[PDB]
DNA sequence: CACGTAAGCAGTCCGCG
DNA sequence: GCGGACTGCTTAC
């Protein structure tokens, strides 16, 4: 097999590499790598190395890496560019793996672990590690086993062994319901003292050294706790055994408000699952507890226990251990679904970077572009300092707030990467500038043609047309990968809808789900078999189709993220290829493209309708337009349609056969006007929206920019079994909006769009009447809580104190003195509730850690003093008032002459 | 900790005769 | 009582 790296480090003048050899074995080597860097040289000097601008360079070979680093410093002292890859381990990987890396995940040791630490005096700070580690569960992907290290004797209590028999049993048998599928995979090791536990864990770690190390909050808690505890008990040298190269560093992670400390373990790649989830999931969650995320992702119930976690080991050690094991398993289950480890490996090996560098698109693209240029013996420029400067972004059209009955939307494929490719935007393809006219002059095609030689953006920039830049070349490769995965995602989505339709008429039979590949549209034979299946098999098939869709989503959306981040990185001062000329060339071209096509679509539809000056495009944001289809429907007449699906088909055909060709013609003209390298502005129909045929539903509405709702029947070729609400920006979509309020507002919107005013009024009246019965957590607002200390003046709100911070300070006074009470952690999220006048808390609101029940000492008082009136007005009535006034209808029935008879 | 900008709403402070 | 200036937070793209 082809060899591949596992980890790489620079330690002094040595590269330390763990890798899989040509026989599939894990090996480690220390290499005295001699790096090369580059200086410009006379044109008269013969060389094969050239910088990206075509200027010749001499290669400087250094005796060691420290010599190379010192040379860079000298070159700065002299005032001369030091060219080449200054991160020597990336150069090492490039030299050692000079081909497309094919990796075998089965050979990569992926470890998932979680620790327990009983603490009677509040949160056990990892920097102090003053409390015993009393449980570790460590899952190893190569063994497929859960290794459980269980401390039976502690200063906080002596306990009996954990029983695997009780663990397997149902909660109703007094058991812990550890999933039957992992029971046989548990290797249980009890210990009569903590020193013995930790020494054995380290021996185990040496035998089974993680390559990828993950878990939940492992980087911020588990790793620093274990390291510091071992350091405290045994000394530094023993703690450093967590690194295969016995090297660690305390790393200070700094933000805008403060800083925290993590432990870098050289020769390990830590991918904390909470950070993978935050970067790659495209959610914003009210809480990031594992319990909360597991419920959201997997629909598994809360791990229930009595009393504080600080007393769980003493009171119920059996449950304590079982829950530690389940915690580790839940992360594996989340990964089986979301597949972020697979994503990181894919991206990391593609770029030839340390796998943990996938968090950084700047590092990822630096390596991709470096490897690409190196293939041609080209030499990368030195990174430079730049001051941070603001620059313009996208255009967003101001919509007229209204209901909109029939709507068809259109959207440009991968816009910013497509602009880069079309225009040929790259550091080395800059050809010069032209004199810029106001943007509106280009939009209306009245400005002088920018160039007859070069490819142009309306920000004034010109680019070469003779050859692709490295940025277009490399962005295209990842774009093409993305396109493949999006194909699979949409097929699985369409396949899901087939199954949903068949579920209307399930068969009374005992059968099995079909063995099919959900990434490909179901054949006719499969469709006929599906129509004969039981509900049990159909539901299992739906679950599998949906899992395939999620896998495709992860793969496609994060490749989209990577390529969009390259466009963004051109506007980040730390990117080697930072250039506001290129960043603005992309964004200004985008503004033109949207407004150009707005004009073209209006012109086309005014022509076919026989009108003049009528605005068919009602809205647009960045790269999308929303077209009113009312006049199109009215031209055939609503009464001519058999059912909803009939007019959806008609609009689909109209969009495909009439509008898209006109849009294409419009963009080809724009490409010629800008003299671009390649026409890549591909704007396809996205959504078809409208009320159910024969209903009083309004179809859709806009309140403002980035705030709208549509009743969608077809999205990007997926014809839904049931209409789907596309809601953007509105409070139903915000993590800050209470859970039950999101749900209620969504139903209000559904009724507005599908059923009409009377239906909306009926639901509002009921919600208003019943909402006080809702669980307090379900009606609590949510906010991130930054700068608590800034606004804290003797326990009370300082000037300009934000509402949620005020709530935290209220909470802090109420729990004062308690070492046990849950503390609000700076930078994390809180639930927030308003408090009625004259409450014993002394202020108008209270806040507590999100994803938790408020502590029992004040729970009863919070419940008694919760201000339901304020809660309803702020989270529900105010947003609903906005939706309904925009839509020109009332959530309460107005008086009429009919009242009364 | 980790790519970019546009832009919405909650809330504070305080003007507005 | 609303709105501008401002901070804070959160989405859409
Ligand atoms: N997370 C992001 N970071 C940087 N730029 C972004 C991001 N999201 C969107 N953009 C910019 O807005 C443009 C339009 O965004 P949109 O979400 O429509 O996706 P797209 O890139 O056009 O891909 P698709 O093919 O899925 O439409 C992008 O091309 C770019
Ligand atoms: Ca725990
Ligand atoms: Ca798009
Ligand atoms: Ca059937
Ligand atoms: Ca879009």
PDB file of N, CA and C in Angstrom, chain A residues 744-745 747-753 755-767 876 880 883-884 887 889-893:
ATOM      1  N   UNK A 744     -44.674  27.818  18.509  1.00  0.00           N
ATOM      2  CA  UNK A 744     -45.933  28.546  18.357  1.00  0.00           C
ATOM      3  C   UNK A 744     -45.887  29.528  17.189  1.00  0.00           C
ATOM      4  N   UNK A 745     -44.796  30.283  17.083  1.00  0.00           N
ATOM      5  CA  UNK A 745     -44.636  31.206  15.962  1.00  0.00           C
ATOM      6  C   UNK A 745     -44.605  30.472  14.617  1.00  0.00           C
ATOM      7  N   UNK A 747     -46.166  27.655  13.898  1.00  0.00           N
ATOM      8  CA  UNK A 747     -47.543  27.262  13.611  1.00  0.00           C
ATOM      9  C   UNK A 747     -48.386  28.454  13.136  1.00  0.00           C
ATOM     10  N   UNK A 748     -48.152  29.628  13.722  1.00  0.00           N
ATOM     11  CA  UNK A 748     -48.811  30.857  13.268  1.00  0.00           C
ATOM     12  C   UNK A 748     -48.476  31.115  11.801  1.00  0.00           C
ATOM     13  N   UNK A 749     -47.192  31.016  11.476  1.00  0.00           N
ATOM     14  CA  UNK A 749     -46.724  31.188  10.113  1.00  0.00           C
ATOM     15  C   UNK A 749     -47.330  30.132   9.180  1.00  0.00           C
ATOM     16  N   UNK A 750     -47.307  28.862   9.591  1.00  0.00           N
ATOM     17  CA  UNK A 750     -47.901  27.798   8.784  1.00  0.00           C
ATOM     18  C   UNK A 750     -49.351  28.119   8.442  1.00  0.00           C
ATOM     19  N   UNK A 751     -50.119  28.520   9.450  1.00  0.00           N
ATOM     20  CA  UNK A 751     -51.522  28.850   9.249  1.00  0.00           C
ATOM     21  C   UNK A 751     -51.704  30.048   8.318  1.00  0.00           C
ATOM     22  N   UNK A 752     -50.900  31.093   8.515  1.00  0.00           N
ATOM     23  CA  UNK A 752     -50.901  32.246   7.609  1.00  0.00           C
ATOM     24  C   UNK A 752     -50.684  31.818   6.155  1.00  0.00           C
ATOM     25  N   UNK A 753     -49.604  31.075   5.907  1.00  0.00           N
ATOM     26  CA  UNK A 753     -49.218  30.696   4.543  1.00  0.00           C
ATOM     27  C   UNK A 753     -50.119  29.646   3.887  1.00  0.00           C
ATOM     28  N   UNK A 755     -53.400  28.361   5.326  1.00  0.00           N
ATOM     29  CA  UNK A 755     -54.810  28.315   5.711  1.00  0.00           C
ATOM     30  C   UNK A 755     -55.476  29.691   5.743  1.00  0.00           C
ATOM     31  N   UNK A 756     -54.732  30.720   6.138  1.00  0.00           N
ATOM     32  CA  UNK A 756     -55.257  32.085   6.103  1.00  0.00           C
ATOM     33  C   UNK A 756     -55.516  32.740   7.450  1.00  0.00           C
ATOM     34  N   UNK A 757     -56.155  33.908   7.400  1.00  0.00           N
ATOM     35  CA  UNK A 757     -56.347  34.785   8.559  1.00  0.00           C
ATOM     36  C   UNK A 757     -57.178  34.186   9.696  1.00  0.00           C
ATOM     37  N   UNK A 758     -58.301  33.559   9.353  1.00  0.00           N
ATOM     38  CA  UNK A 758     -59.203  32.997  10.357  1.00  0.00           C
ATOM     39  C   UNK A 758     -58.525  31.881  11.149  1.00  0.00           C
ATOM     40  N   UNK A 759     -57.768  31.037  10.448  1.00  0.00           N
ATOM     41  CA  UNK A 759     -57.014  29.957  11.077  1.00  0.00           C
ATOM     42  C   UNK A 759     -55.960  30.494  12.044  1.00  0.00           C
ATOM     43  N   UNK A 760     -55.251  31.537  11.617  1.00  0.00           N
ATOM     44  CA  UNK A 760     -54.256  32.216  12.451  1.00  0.00           C
ATOM     45  C   UNK A 760     -54.886  32.773  13.731  1.00  0.00           C
ATOM     46  N   UNK A 761     -56.039  33.417  13.586  1.00  0.00           N
ATOM     47  CA  UNK A 761     -56.743  34.018  14.722  1.00  0.00           C
ATOM     48  C   UNK A 761     -57.147  32.969  15.761  1.00  0.00           C
ATOM     49  N   UNK A 762     -57.611  31.819  15.276  1.00  0.00           N
ATOM     50  CA  UNK A 762     -58.025  30.708  16.131  1.00  0.00           C
ATOM     51  C   UNK A 762     -56.853  30.174  16.966  1.00  0.00           C
ATOM     52  N   UNK A 763     -55.692  30.024  16.331  1.00  0.00           N
ATOM     53  CA  UNK A 763     -54.513  29.516  17.019  1.00  0.00           C
ATOM     54  C   UNK A 763     -53.933  30.513  18.015  1.00  0.00           C
ATOM     55  N   UNK A 764     -53.902  31.788  17.640  1.00  0.00           N
ATOM     56  CA  UNK A 764     -53.406  32.816  18.547  1.00  0.00           C
ATOM     57  C   UNK A 764     -54.218  32.827  19.839  1.00  0.00           C
ATOM     58  N   UNK A 765     -55.542  32.803  19.701  1.00  0.00           N
ATOM     59  CA  UNK A 765     -56.449  32.883  20.846  1.00  0.00           C
ATOM     60  C   UNK A 765     -56.181  31.735  21.819  1.00  0.00           C
ATOM     61  N   UNK A 766     -55.927  30.551  21.271  1.00  0.00           N
ATOM     62  CA  UNK A 766     -55.621  29.376  22.083  1.00  0.00           C
ATOM     63  C   UNK A 766     -54.260  29.452  22.780  1.00  0.00           C
ATOM     64  N   UNK A 767     -53.219  29.842  22.044  1.00  0.00           N
ATOM     65  CA  UNK A 767     -51.884  29.960  22.632  1.00  0.00           C
ATOM     66  C   UNK A 767     -51.859  30.970  23.777  1.00  0.00           C
ATOM     67  N   UNK A 876     -43.340  36.590  21.817  1.00  0.00           N
ATOM     68  CA  UNK A 876     -44.413  36.076  20.964  1.00  0.00           C
ATOM     69  C   UNK A 876     -45.233  37.167  20.266  1.00  0.00           C
ATOM     70  N   UNK A 880     -44.957  38.354  16.271  1.00  0.00           N
ATOM     71  CA  UNK A 880     -46.180  38.056  15.518  1.00  0.00           C
ATOM     72  C   UNK A 880     -46.810  39.320  14.927  1.00  0.00           C
ATOM     73  N   UNK A 883     -44.924  40.044  11.830  1.00  0.00           N
ATOM     74  CA  UNK A 883     -45.289  39.137  10.723  1.00  0.00           C
ATOM     75  C   UNK A 883     -46.628  39.540  10.097  1.00  0.00           C
ATOM     76  N   UNK A 884     -47.623  39.789  10.945  1.00  0.00           N
ATOM     77  CA  UNK A 884     -48.988  40.038  10.482  1.00  0.00           C
ATOM     78  C   UNK A 884     -49.165  41.415   9.832  1.00  0.00           C
ATOM     79  N   UNK A 887     -47.744  41.156   6.508  1.00  0.00           N
ATOM     80  CA  UNK A 887     -48.625  40.342   5.667  1.00  0.00           C
ATOM     81  C   UNK A 887     -50.007  40.960   5.452  1.00  0.00           C
ATOM     82  N   UNK A 889     -52.565  41.426   7.644  1.00  0.00           N
ATOM     83  CA  UNK A 889     -53.693  40.746   8.273  1.00  0.00           C
ATOM     84  C   UNK A 889     -53.631  40.853   9.797  1.00  0.00           C
ATOM     85  N   UNK A 890     -54.694  40.421  10.469  1.00  0.00           N
ATOM     86  CA  UNK A 890     -54.800  40.577  11.917  1.00  0.00           C
ATOM     87  C   UNK A 890     -54.787  39.241  12.647  1.00  0.00           C
ATOM     88  N   UNK A 891     -54.030  39.174  13.737  1.00  0.00           N
ATOM     89  CA  UNK A 891     -54.013  37.977  14.575  1.00  0.00           C
ATOM     90  C   UNK A 891     -55.186  37.943  15.564  1.00  0.00           C
ATOM     91  N   UNK A 892     -55.909  39.058  15.659  1.00  0.00           N
ATOM     92  CA  UNK A 892     -57.147  39.142  16.441  1.00  0.00           C
ATOM     93  C   UNK A 892     -58.281  39.663  15.560  1.00  0.00           C
ATOM     94  N   UNK A 893     -59.455  39.045  15.668  1.00  0.00           N
ATOM     95  CA  UNK A 893     -60.600  39.421  14.838  1.00  0.00           C
ATOM     96  C   UNK A 893     -61.127  40.818  15.171  1.00  0.00           C
TER      97      UNK A 893
END
